[PDB]
Write a protein that binds this ligand. Sequence first.
Ligand SMILES: Nc1ncnc2c1ncn2[C@@H]1O[C@H](COP(=O)(O)OP(=O)(O)O)[C@@H](O)[C@H]1O
Ligand SMILES: Nc1ncnc2c1ncn2[C@@H]1O[C@H](COP(=O)(O)OP(=O)(O)O)[C@@H](O)[C@H]1O
Ligand SMILES: Nc1ncnc2c1ncn2[C@@H]1O[C@H](COP(=O)(O)OP(=O)(O)O)[C@@H](O)[C@H]1O
Lengths: 474, 721, 20
Amino acid sequence: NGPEIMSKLAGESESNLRKAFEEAEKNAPAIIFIDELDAIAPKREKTHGEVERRIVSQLLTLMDGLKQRAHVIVMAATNRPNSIDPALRRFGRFDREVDIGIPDATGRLEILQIHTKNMKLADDVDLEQVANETHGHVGADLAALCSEAALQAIRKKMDLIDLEDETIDAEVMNSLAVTMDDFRWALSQSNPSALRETVVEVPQVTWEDIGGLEDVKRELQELVQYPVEHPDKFLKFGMTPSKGVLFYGPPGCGKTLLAKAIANECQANFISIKGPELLTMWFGESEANVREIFDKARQAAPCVLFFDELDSIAKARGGNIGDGGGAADRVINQILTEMDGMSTKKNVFIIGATNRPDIIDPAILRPGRLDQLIYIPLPDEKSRVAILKANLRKSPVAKDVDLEFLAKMTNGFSGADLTEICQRACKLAIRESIESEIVPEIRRDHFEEAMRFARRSVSDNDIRKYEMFAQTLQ
Amino acid sequence: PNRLIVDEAINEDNSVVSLSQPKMDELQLFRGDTVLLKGKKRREAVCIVLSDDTCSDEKIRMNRVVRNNLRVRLGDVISIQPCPDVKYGKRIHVLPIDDTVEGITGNLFEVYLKPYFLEAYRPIRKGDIFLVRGGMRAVEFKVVETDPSPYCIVAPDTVIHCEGEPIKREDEEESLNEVGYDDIGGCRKQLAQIKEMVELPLRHPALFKAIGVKPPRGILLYGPPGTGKTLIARAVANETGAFFFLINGPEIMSKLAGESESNLRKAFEEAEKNAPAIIFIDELDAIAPKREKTHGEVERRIVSQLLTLMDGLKQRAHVIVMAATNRPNSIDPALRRFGRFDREVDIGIPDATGRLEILQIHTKNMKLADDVDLEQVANETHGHVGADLAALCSEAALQAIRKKMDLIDLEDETIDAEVMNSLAVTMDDFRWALSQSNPSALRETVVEVPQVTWEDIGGLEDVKRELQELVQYPVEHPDKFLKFGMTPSKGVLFYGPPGCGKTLLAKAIANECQANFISIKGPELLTMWFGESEANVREIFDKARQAAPCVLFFDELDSIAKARGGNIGDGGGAADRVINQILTEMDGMSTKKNVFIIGATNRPDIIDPAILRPGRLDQLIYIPLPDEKSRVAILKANLRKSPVAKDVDLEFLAKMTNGFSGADLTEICQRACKLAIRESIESEIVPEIRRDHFEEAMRFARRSVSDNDIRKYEMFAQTLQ
Amino acid sequence: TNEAQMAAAAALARLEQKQS
Ligand SMILES: Nc1ncnc2c1ncn2[C@@H]1O[C@H](COP(=O)(O)OP(=O)(O)O)[C@@H](O)[C@H]1O
Ligand SMILES: Nc1ncnc2c1ncn2[C@@H]1O[C@H](COP(=O)(O)OP(=O)(O)O)[C@@H](O)[C@H]1O
Ligand SMILES: Nc1ncnc2c1ncn2[C@@H]1O[C@H](COP(=O)(O)OP(=O)(O)O)[C@@H](O)[C@H]1O
C-alpha cells in the first residue's frame, strides 16, 4: 500500500518494493496487490521531488521484470485510471484494467444479503427497501450500515440479558433479531461516500411509464435496437446506423423518459449528463472533462449517453442577445470532437434534449452526429388520458374520477403539468385521510380541487415557436 | 433479575437514582423507598429511588458519586434490591479527603458537613464517598465509622463527628473532581453520539470479540477553539477507563526529520501496550495537512506515517484514535477514507441554552447572590465558547474575593473555610467580567434549536398549518404518503415584503419538531461565487445532514441573480456556478435524513426558475404585510411579557399602521415598553404601560415598506394566479 | 417504609429547589 512504501526513507521505499517482487517469485504462483497506487506512482511531470521520480522508475522496472518472474501477477487499485503516471499502462505492465464502479440497486441488495448472512432478521425486515433507499452507497457503506443496525439491536438486548463475561452464550445471540426499525435507524445515521460520483446503471423506466408518443417509441427502437439485433440486415442493405438523435419541443413532455425507456428495454447503461454539469465545465474552463465522459460511455458500452439541456450554455450566454461570439464554445467543441472520433460499432447511442433548438450550434446536427430530429409536442387528448392513468398507478383512485373529462379540460397542459394534478390530488386525499383519524381513495373532489391550482406551464407564445420550427423541418 | 445498566442521571443528588416504572414494579418498590445497589469488588451503596420520563427500562440513572462508590463505570451492570428495614442512625464519623483539603483550614464540619446532613435525611453506608460543594471549593468526605451497620439514614438529631487528619485517597477510588461528562455543557447531542460509538468498544471488549461487528477506530471532532473538543476526548477516556494519550500537531512538527515520525509511532505502540486506550491528536490539520497543499517530502512523509498507523489499528486491539481540527476539510482526504477516521462529529459553537449550561457547570462551587441571572448572561454572551464562559465565571469569583475576603484574610496560601463560604458573587461581578472578556468565535455560524413557537407569529394562520403539513406529516403519517403514492416536497420558498415573519416561520416549525435551525445568508452565497469557492456549498448541505433533524434556511436567494446584475445584468439567464452546485446538493438530499429546506427572497421575480422545479423549492407561499386582524395580533403578542394598561387601544394603533410590517409593529410595542421602564426607574430617584407610552412611541416608529414595494409584491403574486 | 419516605421528601426538596 502507498503509505507503507512512501513513508520510508530514500533507499528503503525502493528496497521494500524490490523485496515484495522477490518474495512473490519465490512463492510463485503469487499475486501482488498494490493498494492506493496513485499514492506511490503519481504522474512524474506533476512532482518535483527526487523520491517520487525514483519510486515511479523503480515500480516500472519491477513491472517489466515480470517477464522473468514467471507466474506472478500484479494487481493494483486506484481511485481513477487517470491519477497515475501513464507509463504504467504501456503494453505489458498494467495493460489490463477493470472498472469496478458503484453497485446499483440490484448489487446493493446482494451486498446487504451477504453482510446479513449471520444476522437474524425479523419478519418485518425488507432489504429491498434498504437497497432502493441507499442511493450513492458502496459496499463498504452497506457493510457499515449492517454493523450499525446490528449494534442498535444488540444494545436493546444486551442491556437486559445481563451477561458480563469473555464469552456470550450461543442462545443469547440466537434470540437476538434485528428489526426494520434498526435498519431504518442506521440509514438515518450513515452517510454515503460515493453519492456525488457519477452513477451509471440500467434505468428502471419502462415504455408503459410514458403516455402517448407511440410513434416515437417505435422510432427509438429502430434507431437503438435494430442495429444490434439484426447487424447482418444492416450490412446486407448497406445501412449506416445513426449514432444519436436530438429531441426538441416544449419542456415536460417526456424527453428524459424516452431516453431512459429505450436504455431499459435494451438493457444498456444510461449515463445522465445534465445542464448544470455542462455549465460547470464551461464556467470553470474545464472542458477536458468532456473527454472523460465519452471515455466512460465507451467503457460502459452498450450504453445510452443522454445530454439534457443541450442549450444550457447558450441560455447562460443569453442566446436571444448573447455577446460578441457565436454559438460555439469550449464544451460543445469538445463534444463535437469526441463524437466524431467515436465508432458506431461500440454500441454507444447518444441522445440529446433541448427546449430551444433554434439556438443549438448547427455543428452538432451535421451528418455523422445528431443527424436525426424528433419533435415531442404537447400530448393530445388520448395521450393526456394515458398520462393520467400511468401517473395514478401508485395510488387508489375512486370510481367517480373521470380522467377523460379532465383530459378534455387540460388541453394546453404538458405531461409534467398532468403529473402535478395527480400528485396534488394525492396530497389532498392524504390530508383528508390524516384528518379522519383526529377517504381511503382519491375522490373526484380531489381532482376537481387540484384543477383550481394546476396551470399549463407552456403558453401559446412558445407553442407557436415549437410548431413553426417543426414545420420548417417538414 | 433486578440487574440494570449504569447510566448518567439528570438528578445531581448524592443519594438519588432514577428508574423507569416497569423496573420499579419488578423491584416491588414505590417512589421514595430506599434500595441497596451492589456493584463490583464487594462494594455497595444506599440510595432513594425516584422516576422520570427520560430513563429507559433497561438502565438505572445515577451520578458520579454513586458510580465511584460502587467502583463501576458507565455501561456496567449492578444489582438493585429494596431494603424497607432501613432505620435512622445514631452516631457517625465523617472525615474529608486530603485531595481536596489543600489551601483550606477552619471548621470544615460547620461549613460543609453540617449544612449537608442537617435535616437532609440522607441514607449513608460505611465507606461512602460524597461531595459537598461551597465556598468556591469542592470537598469530598468519607464515612469511616457508624454505630448502625452497614447503612443508616442520618436524621437531624444524630451526632456527627469530624476529628482527625484528612484521609489519603485509596487506590480503589478516584477523585470526584476529575474531568467527567458532567463537566461538559453544550453539545450534549454530540457527546451522546460519541458515547454510543466509543463506550462499548472500550468498556465491554468481550462484546466485539464475540459478536461479528466492527468497532469505530477513529473519530474526528471539529469546531472553533474553546468549544470542548479536547474536553470531550479526555472526559470519554476518564469515564470509560481507557488510557489517554495526548498528541498535537505543532509539537510533533517542531521536531527534526525522523524525530517526528518516531514520536508518532511510539504513541501508537504505547496505546497498544496500555490498551484499552484512546489516542487524541490535536490540530490534525497541522500534523497531517493536505498533501496536495504542501511541497516538501517531510510534510508528505508524516502524512503517510499517520495513514499507515491508522490502518495498523486493525491489529492494535481496543485502541481508538480521536482527532480535533478547526475545519473538517483542512486535513488530507485520505484520513477520512473507510477505516481510519471513518466517523466525525460536528461540535460547533454552543447556543444560548448550551452557554447557560456551561455557566452553571463552572459555578457549581460558587455561592451566587440572588441578583445573579446566568440566563441573562448566556443571552448576552453571543460569540462566546466554553473557554470564554469559564473565564467569565473565574473572573467573577476573583472580584468577589478581592472586594470582601482580602479585607478579612492574610496575604498567605491558607484561608479559613468559614470566610470562603461567607462570600457571595453578585451580578455586578459577572457584568464586570463580561466587559473584560471578548468572544473568540463571533464570526462563525452558530446552529441552534430555536425557541420561537407558533404563538410568537401574528397572522399567517394558514401558513403555519401549511408548514406542519409539509414538514411533520411526511414522517408522522408515512403510511398515507406511501398509500397514495405521493412524493413529499423537500422544501418551500417564501416571498414578499421584508419583516413579515419569514424567519419566525422557519424557526417555529423547527422548534415544534425539536430540530436544529441553520441560518444561511446571502453574503455567504455571494462570497462563494466571487471567490470561486463553491466547495463551501457542500459544507452547508453536509452540516445539515449532520445536524439532522434540522431546517436549512437559505435567505436572500436573489443574491445570486443580483450578483449577475439583478435589475440590469447581461442578456442571459440566472444560471451560474453557485446555484448549480446548490441545486445539485438539493437533488442528492433525501427526505429520509429529516432535513427540510426553506428559502426566502424579497425579489422573487429574479429567482432562477430551476430552484422551483419538482424536487426543489416547488412550493410557493406569499407572505404579505399583516392585515387589520393580523396587525392587532402582532401588537398583542409583543406585549405578552409586560402589563398593559386598560387605556391602551391596540386596535386604533393597528388601524393607523396600515403600511407597517410586523418588524415595525414590534418596534412600537418595544419602544412603549422602554418608555414605561424609563418612567418606572425615574419614580424611584410605572406598574404597566400606559396609553401615553404607546402614543409617544408612535412619534418615532415608521413604516419600512413603501407603497411602491407593496405593489411590486402584489403584482407578482397576481401573476402566479 | 416511613424513614425511607422522609429521606425521599428531603431529597425531593433539594432537587426541586435547585432545578426549579
Ligand atoms: N408522456 C409522458 N408520460 C408520463 N409522464 C410524463 C410525460 N411527459 C412528462 N411527464 C412527466 O413530467 C416529468 C418531467 O419529464 P422530463 O422528460 O424529465 O422533462 P425534461 O426532460 O424537460 O426535464 C416527468 O417526471 C414525468 O412524470
Ligand atoms: N463545551 C464545554 N463545556 C464545558 N466547559 C467547557 C467546554 N469547552 C470548554 N470548556 C472549558 O474551557 C476550558 C477549555 O480548555 P482546554 O481543555 O485546554 O480546551 P481547548 O482545547 O479549547 O484549549 C476548560 O476549563 C473547560 O472546562
Ligand atoms: N408576523 C410577525 N409576527 C410577530 N413579529 C414579527 C412578524 N414579522 C416580523 N416580526 C418581528 O420582526 C423581526 C424581524 O423578523 P424577520 O423575519 O427576521 O425579518 P427579515 O425579513 O428581515 O428576516 C422579528 O424579530 C419579529 O419580532
